[PDB]
Design a protein around this ligand. Structure first.
Ligand SMILES: [Cl-]
Ligand SMILES: [Cl-]
Length: 162
């Protein structure tokens, strides 16, 4: 199990524009296209992203290219962030996949926001961090995925995904 397989489980794969849990226009593997209500703005962003006229539909390959860019952007975003970087450096490779999951789903800014949890993670206070992470809109909004991520952080094992 790795970060790519973990995310593919959590986000699914969809070849046609769709709406996320929050209601945003998304495509492929969790790739947020826009927060704008227009399905036309979405189609617009979509073709810009792919480099062709898609009419809201893409191939598996295309979807895979997008996913590769986003994980890379997630990682680089973590490494470039003054709040995130130290937590990350401090962690083992499984736990690291967990911070990467979060950043991919809620953006660098969001996660950088989780001040307290971050501090507990760095101090390697697992249980307490787990509890604190659950006291969030994130957890309330998508609880089954959040539980899986939270367990990965608390444990350093891939249990929740096996
Ligand atoms: Cl893009
Ligand atoms: Cl969920």
């Amino acid at each position: 199990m790795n970060i790519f397989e973990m995310l593919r489980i959590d986000e699914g794969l969809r070849l046609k524009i769709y709406k996320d849990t929050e209601g945003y226009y998304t495509i492929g593997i969790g790739h947020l296209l826009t927060k704008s209500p227009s399905l036309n703005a979405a189609k617009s962003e979509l073709d810009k992203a792919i480099g062709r006229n898609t009419n809201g539909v893409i191939t598996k390959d295309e979807a895979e290219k997008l996913f590769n860019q986003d994980v890379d952007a997630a990682v680089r975003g973590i490494l470039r962030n003054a709040k995130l970087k130290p937590v990350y450096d401090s962690l083992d490779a499984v736990r690291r996949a967990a911070a990467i999951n979060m950043v991919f789903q809620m953006g660098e800014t969001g996660v950088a926001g989780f001040t307290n949890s971050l501090r507990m993670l760095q101090q390697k206070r697992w249980d307490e961090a787990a509890v604190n992470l659950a006291k969030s809109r994130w957890y309330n909004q998508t609880p089954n995925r959040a539980k899986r991520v939270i367990t990965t952080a608390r444990t350093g094992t891939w249990d929740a995904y096996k």
